[PDB]
Design a protein around this nucleic acid. Structure first.
Ligand SMILES: [Mg+2]
Ligand SMILES: [Mg+2]
Ligand SMILES: [Mg+2]
Ligand SMILES: [Mg+2]
Ligand SMILES: [Mg+2]
Ligand SMILES: [Mg+2]
Ligand SMILES: [Mg+2]
Ligand SMILES: [Mg+2]
Ligand SMILES: [Mg+2]
Ligand SMILES: [Mg+2]
Ligand SMILES: [Mg+2]
Ligand SMILES: [Mg+2]
Ligand SMILES: [Mg+2]
Ligand SMILES: [Mg+2]
Lengths: 75, 140, 145
RNA sequence: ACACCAUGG
RNA sequence: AGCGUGUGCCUACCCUACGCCGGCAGGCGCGGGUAACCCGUUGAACCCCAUUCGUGAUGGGGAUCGGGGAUUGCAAUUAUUCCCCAUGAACGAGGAAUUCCCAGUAAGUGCGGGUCAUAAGCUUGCGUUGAUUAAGUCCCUGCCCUUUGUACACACCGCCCG
RNA sequence: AGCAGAGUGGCGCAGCGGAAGCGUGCUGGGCCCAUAACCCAGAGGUCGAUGGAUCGAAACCAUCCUCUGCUACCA
């Protein structure tokens, strides 16, 4: 056991990294954003939904268990 | 009462009333203060010939000379609802072989008689015997 | 988003600011989680903001509800202490009122040496459990002499 | 193409 | 869904619909059933779909303990059972060893019978979602048949030498 | 009194600065129809005491104490 540090709401650096991580990924799930950033996970969900409301990402499958996104359906 | 507050001029009661007003209450007005079990035991509570305990407990708090105590009514009735009238008395409760005396305090209210006279000696252990461990068994 | 102070020291205990407010205030004794949801509901507070997102005036609105529940219309069957044995009141003992009320209750029991008082004294099991093969704290004994 | 295997109210 | 049980011959109790009251356990009222006729089209759990939590002994886990409210009974204290608020322990896949199992089987999951005034962490049955691995061998623990050796026959847990 | 060696788990001991274990014993369990042998868990520590160096020691340095072997054997 260790201390997996995580934030519940963003700091400006992390908010920049979110609005710039979109193209970098071809797999956008709450888990991967919660691990590559220091995000609680209930925060990664809200942030991903916020981005999706901006058309910045494309939802490829949502389930009660697991959610996924994609890059831009481009390129 | 034997302390600064418990049913005193300074504030402590039973359920919000004084022992003096409790002796001025009837079983019906009184059972609304008792907890659920004693309420059921009085609601259902014809108390058929448990009344000998109540009588003999009086008629013995009366013959008591002033500034003294009554001697010992002694009984097998271990499940008797302690009522505000039984207070101050001197009772011997059957253990299973002895009668153990119990002076009644006001704080004993609503508890049971048998709850003050335990049926066994508390254990303290000897040394383990020849069968105590799975290793211990062997004699030539 | 919302980068102001989070941790708050509600009466005598450190309520962490991160957890959801419902599961945040449960760090108070005497206040489980089923009671907390009722307190927050009667306080009109949103139930999707952490402890860090409440200003200094809502928290008093919540405290005064936790302390005086009977009057904010939280029924008399939620309160953990009922017809209190010494004076007939109904209330939630909160933080050290819980410790003292347990202490006073055990003293009350031992004083007239009820069968439960002696069990609390001797340090045994107070309800009706068998004790032959349970609890079992002490050290092993050997048959050797 | 062979390690160690004693004893019995 | 499937197997079932249901007014009791002394004995003295049965399964419950539907209305109303109460947060809950429960209470009152008024019908059906001696049963493919009524409970009952037995609206079972896991599963299925959607929301909150986020690797933290945490909302995992639910021991121990305080206070209160009902039902059974002649009687509930050493708390019968049941409900509510509160308290929130060990436990982060378990050493040497060792148990059961081959297809609707192992396991997960709930439901009836028995005991039963009240009442399963038991047992006896029932369905429900439903795998991985084998089609073998005599190695281990044992079993059956033949040949062979014995100083054993209370029979190798035997007998016996200094 | 002197020299040399040692002082660590009940007992024998290992431990060339990044710091507590080994053999045996004790308590308990495993294996077997039993018992010994054999297998595993647990408890048990002022690392002789006192100061100092070192970023840090049981270990290095200084003083003292306690055991063992050998000579000295000393009004
Ligand atoms: Mg043998
Ligand atoms: Mg011998
Ligand atoms: Mg011999
Ligand atoms: Mg019983
Ligand atoms: Mg069953
Ligand atoms: Mg029954
Ligand atoms: Mg049953
Ligand atoms: Mg049985
Ligand atoms: Mg054969
Ligand atoms: Mg022959
Ligand atoms: Mg022969
Ligand atoms: Mg012979
Ligand atoms: Mg013989
Ligand atoms: Mg032999």
């Amino acid at each position: 056991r260790d201390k997996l540090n995580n934030l519940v709401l963003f700091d400006k650096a992390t908010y920049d990294k979110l609005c710039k991580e979109v193209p970098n990924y071809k797999l956008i799930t709450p888990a991967v954003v919660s691990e590559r950033l220091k995000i609680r996970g209930s925060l990664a969900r809200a942030a991903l939904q916020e981005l999706l409301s901006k058309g910045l990402i494309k939802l490829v499958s949502k389930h009660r268990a697991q959610v996924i996104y994609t890059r831009n359906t481009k390129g | 009462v034997e302390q600064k507050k418990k049913r005193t001029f300074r504030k402590f009661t039973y359920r919000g009333v004084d022992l003096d007003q409790l002796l001025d209450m009837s079983y019906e007005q009184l059972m609304q203060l008792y907890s659920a079990r004693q309420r059921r035991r009085l609601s259902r509570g014809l108390r058929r010939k448990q009344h000998s305990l109540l009588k003999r407990l009086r008629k013995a708090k009366k013959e008591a000379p002033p500034m003294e105590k009554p001697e010992v009514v002694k009984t097998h009735l271990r499940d008797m609802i302690i009522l505000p009238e039984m207070v101050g008395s001197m009772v011997g409760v059957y253990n299973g072989k002895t009668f153990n005396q119990v002076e009644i305090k006001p704080e004993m209210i609503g508890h049971y008689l048998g709850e003050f006279s335990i049926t066994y000696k508390p254990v303290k252990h000897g040394r383990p015997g020849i069968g105590a461990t799975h290793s211990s068994r062997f004699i030539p | 988003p919302e980068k102001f102070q989070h941790i708050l020291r509600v009466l005598n205990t450190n309520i962490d600011g991160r957890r959801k407010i419902a599961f945040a205030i449960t760090a108070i004794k005497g206040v489980g989680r089923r009671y907390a949801h009722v307190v927050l509901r009667k306080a009109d507070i949103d139930l999707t903001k952490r402890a860090g997102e409440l200003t200094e005036d809502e928290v008093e609105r919540v405290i005064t509800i936790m302390q005086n529940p009977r009057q904010y219309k939280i029924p008399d069957w939620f309160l953990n202490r009922q017809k209190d044995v010494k004076d007939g009141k109904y209330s939630q003992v909160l933080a050290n009122g819980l410790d003292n009320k347990l202490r006073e209750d055990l003293e009350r029991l031992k004083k007239i040496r009820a069968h439960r008082g002696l069990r609390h004294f001797w340090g045994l099991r107070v309800r009706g459990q068998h004790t032959k093969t349970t609890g079992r704290r002490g050290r092993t004994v050997g048959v050797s002499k």
